Amino acid sequence: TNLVAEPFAKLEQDFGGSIGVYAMDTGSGATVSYRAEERFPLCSSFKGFLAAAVLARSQQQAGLLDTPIRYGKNALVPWSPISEKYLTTGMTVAELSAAAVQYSDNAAANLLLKELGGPAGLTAFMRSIGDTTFRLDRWELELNSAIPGDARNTSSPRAVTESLQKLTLGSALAAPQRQQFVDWLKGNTTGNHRIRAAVPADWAVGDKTGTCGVYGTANDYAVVWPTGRAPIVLAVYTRAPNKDDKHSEAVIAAAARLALEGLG
């Protein structure tokens, strides 16, 4: 039996569902993998990749990130705490991106999707960096049904981690864009009980969360800079078979701890 995997299996069994984990130590190449290639709903975790795709576009569209977007109430949707405040002043593309990443702002995410040509445009960006797994085909708040066996609006922990590495540490973005993406992730406000809860306080973390809620479905992915080490990239996703099964932040943190423990 896979002895590395046993504690993850116990964790998911106690949770009442399935947990998917992939973690990469970018310094040694070591990995920890559990259900790493299975699909899980993205939920709001797509918004990190959204911001990266906008940054990529901004490399060749001069002043895109600086452009004020003047939107009206028709653009607002539930859980848009940043964009509700700028109906008469607008937000720049950079500000919308920070709101989508750091507050999971739904209206901001939809405005940014428009800049890419919709969910298909984000999916095409992901294909362009070599991610064949990511799929997104709805706008907020229509991508979160998380129905078991529906591959729409899903990715895998492994593909999420691989793409996150390319974008935050590798060469998929030009350096000033890579750096902005990292700084947005580091300022996330919604992840304090997930991967951030699994690391020492002195280790820097950038992350993006998602919580479909139904079907026990929630997630987090992160880049972690342990003191004195190369960074770790990891993703933790959950789901469960019944619509009213509850997600758990504690399970996500616990899986992240096991991942860090299993790395060399």
Name the residues annotated as catalytic.
44, 142
Question: ω before 141 within 30° of 0 (cis)?
Answer: yes
Using CA atoms, how far apart are residues 236 and 147, in angstroms rounded to an integer? Answer: 18
State the amino acid at position 186 in one-letter form. K
Asked whether the beta carbons of 158 and 137 are under 8 A apart, the reply is no
Using CA atoms, how far apart are residues 112 and 126, in angstroms rounded to an integer? Answer: 15
| Method of determination used here | X-ray
For residue 228, what are the contacts with CB-CB under 8 A and spacing of at least 6? none
6: tokens are: 């046993």
Find the CATH number of the domain harbouring 181: 3.40.710.10
Single out the residue of 91, 133, 128 nearest to residue 112, CA to CA: 91
Annotated binding site for a beta-lactam: 44, 47, 79, 104, 106, 209, 211
Annotated binding site: 44, 47, 79, 104, 106, 209, 211
Asked whether the beta carbons of 96 and 67 are under 8 A apart, the reply is no
Q: Is 175 exposed, middle or buried (0-12, 13-18, 19+ CB in 10 A)?
A: exposed
Using CA atoms, how far apart are residues 174 and 167, in angstroms rounded to an integer? Answer: 9
Q: Look at the chain and report how many structural domains it folds into.
A: 1
Please tell me what resolution, in angstroms, this structure has. 1.0
Domain that holds residue 67: 4-262
Single out the residue of 165, 162, 115, 146 nearest to residue 247, CA to CA: 146
